[PDB]
Amino acid sequence: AGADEERAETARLSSFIGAIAIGDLVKSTLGPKGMDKILLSSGRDASLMVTNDGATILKNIGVDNPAAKVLVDMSRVQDDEVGDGTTSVTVLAAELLREAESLIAKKIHPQTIIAGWREATKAARQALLNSAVDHGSDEVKFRQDLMNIAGTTLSSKLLTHHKDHFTKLAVEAVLRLKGSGNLEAIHVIKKLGGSLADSYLDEGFLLDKKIGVNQPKRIENAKILIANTGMKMKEKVERILKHGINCFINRQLIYNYPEQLFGAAGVMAIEHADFVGVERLALVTGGEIASTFDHPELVKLGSCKLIEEVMIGEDKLIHFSGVALGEACTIVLRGATQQILDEAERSLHDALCVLAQTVKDSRTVYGGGCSEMLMAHAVTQLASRTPGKEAVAMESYAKALRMLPTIIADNAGYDSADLVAQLRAAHSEGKTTAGLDMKEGTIGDMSVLGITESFQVKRQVLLSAAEAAEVILRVDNIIKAAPR
Amino acid sequence: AGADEERAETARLSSFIGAIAIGDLVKSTLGPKGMDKILLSSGRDASLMVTNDGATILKNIGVDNPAAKVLVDMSRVQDDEVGDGTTSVTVLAAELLREAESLIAKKIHPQTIIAGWREATKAARQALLNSAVDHGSDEVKFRQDLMNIAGTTLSSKLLTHHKDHFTKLAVEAVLRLKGSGNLEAIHVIKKLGGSLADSYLDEGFLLDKKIGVNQPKRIENAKILIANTGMDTDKIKIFGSRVRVDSTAKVAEIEHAEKEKMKEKVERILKHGINCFINRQLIYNYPEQLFGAAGVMAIEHADFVGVERLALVTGGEIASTFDHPELVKLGSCKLIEEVMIGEDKLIHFSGVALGEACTIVLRGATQQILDEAERSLHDALCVLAQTVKDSRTVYGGGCSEMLMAHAVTQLASRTPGKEAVAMESYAKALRMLPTIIADNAGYDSADLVAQLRAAHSEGKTTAGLDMKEGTIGDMSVLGITESFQVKRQVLLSAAEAAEVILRVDNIIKAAPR
Amino acid sequence: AGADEERAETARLSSFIGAIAIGDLVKSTLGPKGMDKILLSSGRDASLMVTNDGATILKNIGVDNPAAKVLVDMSRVQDDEVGDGTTSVTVLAAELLREAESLIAKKIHPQTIIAGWREATKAARQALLNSAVDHGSDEVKFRQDLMNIAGTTLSSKLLTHHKDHFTKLAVEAVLRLKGSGNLEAIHVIKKLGGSLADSYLDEGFLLDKKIGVNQPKRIENAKILIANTGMDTDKIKIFGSRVRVDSTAKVAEIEHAEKEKMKEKVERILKHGINCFINRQLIYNYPEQLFGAAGVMAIEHADFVGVERLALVTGGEIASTFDHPELVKLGSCKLIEEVMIGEDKLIHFSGVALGEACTIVLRGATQQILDEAERSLHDALCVLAQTVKDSRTVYGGGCSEMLMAHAVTQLASRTPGKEAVAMESYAKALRMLPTIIADNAGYDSADLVAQLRAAHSEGKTTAGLDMKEGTIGDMSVLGITESFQVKRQVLLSAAEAAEVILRVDNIIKAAPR
Amino acid sequence: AGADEERAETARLSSFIGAIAIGDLVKSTLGPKGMDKILLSSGRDASLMVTNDGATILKNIGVDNPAAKVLVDMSRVQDDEVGDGTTSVTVLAAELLREAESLIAKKIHPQTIIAGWREATKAARQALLNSAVDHGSDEVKFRQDLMNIAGTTLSSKLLTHHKDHFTKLAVEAVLRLKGSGNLEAIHVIKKLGGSLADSYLDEGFLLDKKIGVNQPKRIENAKILIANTGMILKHGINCFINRQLIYNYPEQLFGAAGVMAIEHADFVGVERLALVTGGEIASTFDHPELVKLGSCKLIEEVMIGEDKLIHFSGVALGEACTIVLRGATQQILDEAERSLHDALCVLAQTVKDSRTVYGGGCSEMLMAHAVTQLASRTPGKEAVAMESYAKALRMLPTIIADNAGYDSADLVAQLRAAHSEGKTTAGLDMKEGTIGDMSVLGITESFQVKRQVLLSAAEAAEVILRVDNIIKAAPR
């Protein structure tokens, strides 16, 4: 007859344990020299999943019963109006718990200490109104288009040797898209051919399948047919000839008889086409209603610009192009003939979401930990000002920022100890631009690098970090849901 | 090895242990910024309920062999009379047992000592008519409506930063329910999402659930239909299986039957002018297409507890088979609509003609501890309804307790005899309450107890414990007051529950592995 | 322990220890200030039960290995005859065994020794009309109605703080019960609602059932109808099931028969003016609809024991089939109404013409302490009924015990031989009763025993132990008197219980391994 | 299967425990609510002995297996060249170890963590001049002569309710003492009696002895005789003081003469008296007259309160004086003897140092805000060692406040804000229960106590980290 019922000190401990385990894994992730981690499952799940982005790995699975899944769940709301950048929001909340040990020596009422969270909102304000930001962002923009935040998100990813060039490309992709609708209608695939650019830009949507060895190489003023039901010959041919049918896409197995017909007719068909490709394609072509063979003609809306199979100097590919809607567009990447090129698939997704927020927010802060050290110098002063109870809690929040300088340089391979003192001295002076340089191994000018963080990511994290920790102390024990 | 057989001294201890074990869990609850506990046991328990309200949790479970269940049950009668604010009745009874060790020293008669509790009646009446309490509560009333007892009941809880505002709000609810007939029908729910106000007051009863994406947004002069039996049709006493047939033609006979259920539902429904349908279970899909076009809003799997509350509100209904529409149903009519409450969508029933039942909604900041607000409202709602009926209250912040302690201390030495030891033990009991109020706030209890006594000793009734101050101050300026009937009953409840347990000492145990 | 087979002297000790163990728990139960104990068990025991009545608890459970359960069983026969007051029969039997240690020293024939309580029979004749007595109990009686034995019976009980008032109330109940009744028409219930009085005396019968929510709230010039046969008509030879039938052809015939039952009940009813109908068993639904329109209140499944008591109260009735109404039925007509009491819905029957039967309603808070009141009251009813019929009583608070003890001491020395040693031992047994009363008085026992003997020795039967005084006082002024029946029966069977235990040696089997 | 094995990290633990074991017993002693502990021993130790100050008890003997004896020996040299204050140097060194656990998380080089200690030598210097704090100690000094550092020394001590006044008094004694005149001829005891001052400062030397019952009670126009060798009318001799046993025959003579003599007077008291009276040539009975120099203002036996003492006063030289002190009698009173030794050393340093810092914890909080910055300016490996040292300073404000009988947590916040502002005057006022103006109080700490206190803490911390083994065995 039970399920939890935790006493004062032990109950506190369970919250404490959840925070420490999460912080170390998310720790390697932060900043340019972040590390990818692989997860192995052998049953229902198929293989090791890297998941470099910290938020995605916590959301996907619920390994154990201690409280932490709900804390994790909130970070997604953070992601929706701004996204990623680098995951630092979870680490700050976790470090709050380490001095809770100090709090037992407090020998009093922990709840008054809660006013420290109130204090934290003031602390957030000195970050919101005191450092970085940017001057213009006129729209589209000749040179302000990128070489900024996309690089920041990308910096964490190792591929940034020639990759930063690809990130730079991403803005052109966002410019075509932007405005209303946020992010979705974009498709990206890697290629095995090697170029210095390592990437190409395409007008249409990319797919990778073939009917068979036989069939025409190219079609024009193409009509697109999508069928729910798999593939009678004559009904298909008589309906087909009038339309001038240039291509057929089926999301499943296809009967052999039609296959011979399509080749002679001059029509290209696709076997087992991915449904997701089809659904995006439907938006692109104006759509249709997928029924029985009555499907060709008026019930089918076709986009007549250009459908062709294009060989990009190696792997056979098929490109759909000239969409009237314009809402959906696809980018095809070349590469330098590396596995890292596979890694670029991982990188593009980072590229479109970061940029969409960057154009809309019209604000940024200096990256590489520059924002973080400056705030830390200021917070020490803050603890002294607050009354008795409030200051002990406030000081702990203040030293929390200290761990970040260590995390950014530790992943660099340089000595973490040496890095902290030198970092603090430059920030103390009043130089917002100055920050951690991992490549150098010391400190340098962040602005020259072109590394910046969305203004929006910083405003939400400071508020979320405070309330989420505040939420946990309120509750002695949680879960819920009962049998029968 | 043995059989856990307890003798005299030890037997007394088990009664003793039960009182101390309960006190530690409940002490956290009293005074500002209490702990909040969930407790899930499995086995005919359908929810992990979190309660910092001592009366509710003690009653729910009869946990073990040692005696304590009988003591706990009585407090509910007290709740019926008023029994709320901060749960101190059980704690006060528990400290009574601590003197029992000194009782062995008091070599005399255990039940002579019991005369002390009848004597507690003398103490109970002493609290009464002694120390001017207050006076007001004219009707509706501008300022005297709150910033009083509800604030103190919630003082005890952490939420009082933002929350005291919510407590202030709860009197508006009592004002609307005034003059109709006692305290009944109050339902409170919390909302996931943050707003500075952290609460909105709706004109009627509130629910969570929607028919579907389609249907008119709002209905006016609504007729309400409640059905015991579901809209679902299929298995009856004749089976087909999970069938479809050999061609198109035979399928039509099955199709036609389904239409007849739709047809009856619309034909009967339109004449009544039906605006909303509420069903306490699964709802068959066909009627929804119908309801959407008609302009009628239906609720799938509506909770039964909400429905019973609603029936008192609407005027009731008799729920049966499809004959259920027209006059067998007594739906009330004003406005039923779904109103965007901040973040999440809710459905509100309002303007009930009967007017005997009303609803309040609290928001919060989206947590399982969000439910803390539900807990605070029960505390707030119950006290104010009584505040209207009692028309009497006492100064809060422990002002009442310290003064009474001063009067009782004098009494013990004055009466020579066997009675005097018993009378004085009761007298220092009052001393702990000042101590508890100070400890929870965030200040040192030792300094507080003595400083407090000097101000009360002087003769100032208004002066009391100021938790925010950390010392003492004018309670009246704060506005904190306690309902008059809570004190009459609390003193009697403590004594009656306590007498039986001291007089009771035989406890039986099973084994230690 | 841990290894056991019984022979000669070892077997005797088990009987010895069992008597002492029970004596301490029961001893507290004797006198104006007694003690209550609670027992906890599982698998048919809901919770710890507080048992004041020693006979009730001993019968209920066989807790351990030593033999004493058989001794316990006999006491029940005594209980129906008269039973209670205070449990003193078991204590006297147990104290008999302490000087058994002396008997090994005596070294002859224990059977010869047995002749000593035959001698105690001589003590019984000695105790016959020796000890003034009490003249009272003429009939009904104003002042001597109570504050006597019932108060003493309740003295032990854990509710005497307010209970002694309840006892006083009970004699009023016995006065109506004498002459033209039996030991019928007595019923009492307990209800939530803390009050100083803790009980109400009703002029009628108390019941708790309702026809349905509909029907007039109050009835007057009431006519009462009681039916042996249920209103239900249908199942007989071919019920089939509860029914809905194919369309409307076959079933129309069956409901029509029902209509005949509906009409007969109303036609007879209206002429009489019927205000209330009480049926002991299931009631048919059709008439229920009809009663509401008429303005007649009926009771479904009323308990038979309550009904018959009501019949003497109302004036009686002849209960047969539907020809029951009009003249064969006799109905009292003061007032019948449904009144909410504290919490639990309840109805009251009052103003009975006969005047020979009435009902008492007790108030508490639904804790099992409240449960205790339900059978505490039962104990009070039984002692008063004996008091009117016996017209014989003896002085209370140990008055009887000291007088007899001084006289019996003389007998031991005076009668030569074997007889002298056995009589003296019986005589010292009586000494403990005065001592037990003093111990539970909170007054030093040594001083009490010494002063007590001198007053009894002097020749005043009225003088006795006053616990409140701390010293010896006049029992008669207090008014505490013991009924004559409790003293003669205890002496008669005290002898026999002793006889079975020591008349045998060697009990055959039941071992640990 | 488990005799005892330890290297590096385990070796560190034995050293770690020795510092923690000492710290709990010592910490109780620190501050106004200091505590007295009882120890029992066998082997040239008769019975349980309790010492209020840590330095006296630690040096007397060495208990066991863990290293700590070497660390302990350093404090007495410190006491000789300055002193006690309140015991705290041992505490600061012990708390340094507690960050060792932090160091494993750091994962670099614990050996060069050690290089941080010479940073500390610099840190003591940086505890100077970057912060303000002195602005005083001019000469005799009007207001700030005392109610200073001595009051802080006194704060640990229970008697501070009237004692703090006594402490103020002590500097007056030192001002007369100061100069080329050596640190000698200062005598102080205690007495039972009434009066608000609770202590008298007298003109001459105080002694407690009696000739015998049969001697004149008062002498005036007194003449003083001091003899090296053991055992009148013309001189008018009023009092005779001899350092040793006095022969019985003369004693009868002195009583009817009108002369008061002192048997077995202590030599140290006699020599001080000689400097005071103008001296004497102590030879054989030829000693009376000119070879004897005797001051004559007045010598008498006076009941201070209850007990009778002999007071020498009205000294012409003025170079040496005596302090009476007063108390409420207990072993705690003997603590005054402990504090007394403690007070003399502080003031002597004050005259020639010419420097002081604000007391009551004012110095410690200001340093803390400043030291956080200091670690950052230096290269990072060096910085971590110094920054850890800086966080150690936080405990001192808390310990002063915790023993005050006021809430420690409240104190830490309010204290820091005053220091942050820039006024060195603000500090911890134990009497107030909150932060107040130290300068009005007049509390300033001797410059030497701060310079060497830091050095003693450093040495205690170093011995544990730089040596892997302190053990012994021999079984094989």
Ordered by start, the domain boundaries in chain D are 1-133+355-476, 134-202+319-354, 203-318
Backbone discontinuities in chain C, residue before each (C to N > 2.5 A): none
Token readout for B335 is 């406005």
Write the DSSP symbol of residue A194. B
Residue B109 near chain C (CB below 8 Å): yes
Q: Which of C327, C216, C352 shows the shortest CA–CA distance to C276?
A: C216
Q: Establish whether chain A is in contact with chain D, requiring a minimum of 3 CB pairs below 8 angstroms.
A: yes
Contacts of residue C194, Cβ cutoff 8 Å, sequence gap at least 6: B77, B81, B489, B492, B493, B496, C363, C364, C365
How was this model experimentally determined?
Answer: cryo-EM
Q: Which helix (DSSP H) or strand (DSSP E) does residue C364 occupy?
A: strand C360-364
Cβ within 8 Å of A, D 375-434: 375-384, 387, 407, 409-417, 419-420
Which residues lie closer than 8 Å to A375 by C-beta, 6 or more apart? A123, A126, A127, A130, A131, A401
* Closest chain A residue by Cα to residue B61: A1
Return the H-helix or E-strand segment holding B18: helix B8-29
- For residue C53, CA distances in Å to C153, C156, C371, C375 come to 9, 9, 14, 9
Cβ pair A385:D412 closer than 8 A:
no
d(CA A67, CA A64): 9
C-alpha triplet C292, C297, C302: angle, nearest 5°: 130
How far apart are alpha carbons C86 and C482 in whole angstroms? 10
Q: Where are the alpha helices (DSSP H) in D83-216?
A: 89-97, 100-106, 110-113, 116-126, 149-156, 160-177
Encoding tokens for residue B249? 């033609």
Let me know: does B359 contact B205? Beta carbons within 8 Å. yes
Tokens of A39: 């997860």
Amino acid at B337: E
User: What class, spelled out in words, does domain A203-326 have in CATH?
Assistant: alpha beta
Q: Do A100 and A16 meet the contact criterion of CB atoms below 8 Å apart?
A: yes
Residue C468, marked binder: no
Phi, then psi, of C88 in degrees rounded to 5 = -115, -15
Backbone φ/ψ region at C466: left (φ over 0), alpha (ψ -120 to 50), beta: beta
Q: Where would I find the H helices in D304-437? A: 331-353, 362-377, 380-392, 395-402, 408-421
The DSSP code sequence of A246-290 is -EEEESS---HHHHHHHHHHT-EEETT--HHHHHHHHHHHT-B--
Q: Tell which residue, A285, A235, A278, has the closest CA to residue A255.
A: A235
R_g of chain A, CA atoms, integer Å? 27
Closest-CA residue of chain C to B71:
C367
C-chain residues near B111 (CB < 8 A): 33-35, 440
Chain B residue nearest residue C37, CA to CA: B504
CA distance B313 to C286: 29
Answer whether A7 touches B (CB < 8 Å): no
> D239 pairs with which residues across the strands?
D224, D260
Q: Which of A36, A156, A160, A180 is nearest to A88 (CA)?
A: A156
Give C277's strand partners.
Answer: C225, C298
Whether residue A480 lies within 8 A of chain B, CB to CB, comes out as: yes
CA distance A67 to A480: 12
User: Phi first, then psi: what are they for A408, rounded to 5°?
Assistant: -65, -40
Q: Which of B157, B163, B368 to probe by mutation at the A interface, max A CB count within 10 Å?
A: B368
Token digits for D34?
A: 């200091």
Identify the CATH homologous superfamily for domain A1-133+363-484.
GroEL-like equatorial domain (1.10.560.10)
From A2, A475, A481, residue closest to B41, measured CB to CB: A2
Instruction: Report the residue of D376, D399, D412 to disrupt the A interface, i.e. the one with the largest count of A CBs within 10 Å.
Output: D376
Q: Which residues have a Cβ under 8 Å from the Cβ of D433 and sit 6 or more positions away?
A: D404, D405, D406
Question: What is the secondary structure of D247-264 as a DSSP string?
Answer: -HHHHHHHHHHT-EEETT
Query: Is residue B87 a known part of a binding site?
Result: yes
Q: Which helix (H) or strand (E) holds C115?
A: helix C110-126
- C194 vs B77: CB contact, 8 Å cut-off? yes
Instruction: Give every strand in the sheet of D308-313, ordered side by side.
Output: D206-207, D308-313, D298-303, D218-219
Hey, are the CB atoms on B158 and A484 less than 8 Å from each other? no
Helices (H), B319-470: 372-390, 399-414, 418-441, 445-458
According to DSSP, the β-strands at D308-313 and D298-303 are antiparallel
A136 is in an annotated binding site: no
User: How many Å is the maximal CA-CA distance in chain C?
Assistant: 102
Distance CA B236, CA B467 (A): 66
Is A450 known as a binding-site position?
no
> Can you read off the two tokens belonging to residue C151?
């108060």
| Chain A partners within 8 Å of B364 (Cβ) | none
CA dist A92 and A375 (Å) reads 13
Residue by residue, what is the 3-state secondary structure of D2-42? CCCCCCCHHHHHHHHHHHHHHHHHHHHHCCCCCCCCCECCC
- Cβ contacts of D387 on chain A, cutoff 8 Å: 421
| Residues in chain D after which the chain is broken, C→N over 2.5 Å | 231
Structure tokens at B219: 């209905």
Residue B316, annotated as binding a ligand: no
Q: Which residues of D are part of a known binding site for ATP?
A: 31, 85-87, 445, 450
The answer to whether the Cα torsion of C220, C224, C225, C230 is positive or negative is positive
Do C497 and C93 form a contact (C-beta atoms < 8 A)?
Answer: yes
Q: Where are the beta strands (DSSP E) in A100-223?
A: 186-189, 205-207, 218-220
CB contact under 8 A, D380 and A421: yes
The verdict on C41 touching B (C-beta cutoff 8 Å) is: yes
Pick the residue from chain B with its C-alpha nearest to A3: B40
**C-alpha dihedral (C108, C502, C493, C426), degrees to nearest 10:** 40
DSSP assignment of A390-432: HHHHHHHHHHHHHHHHHHHHHTTTS-HHHHHHHHHHHHHHT-S
Provide the token pair at B73: 């049950």
Identity (one letter) of the amino acid at A132? A
* Residues D370-406 as b or e (16 or more Cβ within 10 Å = b): bbbbbbbebebbbbbbbbbbbbbbebbbbbbbbbbeb
Q: Kindly state whether A2 is in contact with chain B, defined as any CB-CB distance less than 8 angstroms.
A: yes
- Please tell me the distance in Å from D126's CA to the nearest CA on chain A: 17
Of D403, D423, D424, D413, the C-alpha closest to D359 is D424
* Chain D nearest CA to A409, separation (Å): 12
Parallel, antiparallel, or unpaired for β D239-242 and D224-227?
A: parallel
- Chains contacting C with at least 3 CB pairs below 8 Å? B
Closest to D176 (Cα-Cα) out of D164, D166, D165, D184: D184
- Which ranges in C415-483 belong to alpha helices (H)? 418-439, 445-458, 475-478
| CA distance to partner chain D, nearest, from residue A425 (Å) | 5
Q: Which residues pair with D187 in a beta bridge?
A: D322
Buried b (16+ CB within 10 A) or exposed e, D139-164: eebeebbbbbbbbbbbbbbbbbeebb
Q: Does A215 touch chain D (CB under 8 A)?
A: no
A474: contact with B, CB 8 A cutoff: yes
Domains B134-202+356-391 and B203-355 share a fold: no
- To the nearest 10 degrees (0 to 180), the angle between helices D116-126 and D362-377 is 130
The answer to whether D175 and D313 are in contact (CB under 8 A) is no
Q: Which helix (H) or strand (E) holds C257?
A: helix C252-272
| Cβ proximity of D446 and D356 under 8 Å | yes
Give, as one character, the DSSP assignment of residue B159. Answer: G
Fold (topology level) of C203-355: GroEL (3.50.7)
C378 within 8 A of C13, measured Cβ to Cβ: no
Say how far apart CA C151 and CA C475 lie, in whole Å. Answer: 14
Chain B interface includes C34 (CB < 8 A): yes
CA distance D465 to chain A (A): 19
Three-state SS at A122: helix
Count of all residues that appear for chain B in the document: 513
Closest A-chain CA to D384: A417
CA triple A349-A352-A354, angle to 5 deg: 100
Closest CA to C150 of C169, C137, C136, C133: C169
Pick the CATH number of A134-202+327-362 from 3.30.43.10, 3.30.260.10, 3.40.30.10, 3.40.50.2000: 3.30.260.10
Burial class (CB in 10 A: 0-12, 13-18, 19+), B460: middle
Subunits next to D (3 or more Cβ pairs <8 Å) are A
Which residue type, as a one-letter code, is found at position C92?
A: L
Q: Identify the DSSP state of A203.
A: S
Instruction: Look at the domain B1-133+392-513 and name its fold.
Output: GROEL; domain 1 (1.10.560)
> Distance of alpha carbon D394 from its chain centroid, rounded?
24
Q: Is B52 exposed, middle or buried (0-12, 13-18, 19+ CB in 10 A)?
A: buried
Q: How far is C125 from chain B (nearest CA, A)?
A: 37
Question: Are the CB atoms for B485 and B386 separated by under 8 Å?
Answer: yes
Decide: C187 and C326 in contact? Cβ < 8 Å: no
C39 → closest Cβ in B492, B493, B506: B506
Report residue D435 as tokens.
Answer: 């932060």
Cα–Cα distance between C191 and C100 in angstroms, integer?
Answer: 50
* Complete edge-to-edge strand list for the sheet that includes strand B224-227: B224-227, B276-279, B297-299
Q: Pairing relation of β-strands A306-311 and A316-321?
A: antiparallel
Q: Which two tokens stand for residue C136?
A: 């009272």
Fill in the amino acid letter for B492.
L
C84 is in an annotated binding site: yes
Question: How many CA atoms lie within 13 Å of D340's alpha carbon, on the beta-carbon side?
Answer: 18
- Other CB atoms within 10 A of residue B362 CB: 23
Pairing of strands B224-227, A442-445: unpaired
CB atoms within 10 A of CB C356: 16
Which of A27, A101, A424, A442 has the highest number of chain D CBs within 10 A, making it the mutation to test binding with D?
A: A424
**How big is the CA angle at A184 (ends A63 and A344), to the nearest 5 degrees?**
70
- CA dist., res. B325 & res. B342, Å (int): 35
Residues C108, C111, C115, C121: is their CA dihedral positive or negative? Answer: positive
Question: Distances from the Cα of D247 to the Cαs of B121, D250, D259, D262, in angstroms?
Answer: 85, 7, 15, 12
Instruction: Please give the resolution of this entry in Å, rounded to 1 decimal.
Output: 10.7
Q: Which two tokens stand for residue C343?
A: 């919490």
All residues of chain A having their beta carbon less than 8 Å from the beta carbon of residue B372 are 474
Chain A adjacent subunits, 3+ CB pairs under 8 A: B, D
Spatial contact of C276 and C291, defined as CB atoms under 8 Å apart: no
**Beta bridge mates, B251:** none
Q: How many CB atoms lie within 10 A of CB A383?
A: 25
Q: Is C487 annotated as a binding residue?
A: yes
For C134-202+356-391, give the CATH class: alpha beta
Annotated binding residue at A432?
A: no
CATH superfamily entry for domain D1-133+355-476: GroEL-like equatorial domain (1.10.560.10)
Across the interface, of A391, A421, A425, the residue whose CB is closest to D416 is A391
**Size (chain C), residues:** 513
Q: Is B37 on the interface with A (CB under 8 A)?
A: yes
Residue whose pair of structure tokens reads 């204290």 in the numeric block:
D415
Q: Which amino acid is at C353?
A: A
> Which of A249, A224, A217, A181 lies closest to A324, judged by CA?
A224
Strand C463-465 versus strand C472-474 pairing type:
antiparallel
Q: How far lies C145's CA from each of A403, C142, C168, C204, C462, in Å?
A: 88, 6, 8, 21, 19
Chain-centroid distance of CA C380 in Å reads: 6
Chains A and C touch (3+ CB pairs under 8 A): no
C-alpha to C-alpha distance for D374 and D131, rounded to whole angstroms: 12
Q: How far apart are CA B182 and CA B316, in angstroms?
A: 20
Domain D134-202+319-354 has what CATH class? alpha beta
To the nearest 10°, report the CA torsion of B32, B35, B41, B45. 40
d(CA D74, CA D456): 7
Instruction: Using alpha carbons, select from B376, B301, B322, B286 the residue that is nearest to residue B86.
Output: B376
Backbone discontinuities in chain A, residue before each (C to N > 2.5 A): 231
**Which chain A residues have a beta carbon less than 8 Å from that of B57?**
none
Q: Does B198 touch chain A if contact means CB atoms closer than 8 Å?
A: no
Distance CA A184, CA A329 (A): 10
Inter-chain Cβ pairs, chain A and chain B, closer than 8 A: 74
Tokens of A63: 């390994």
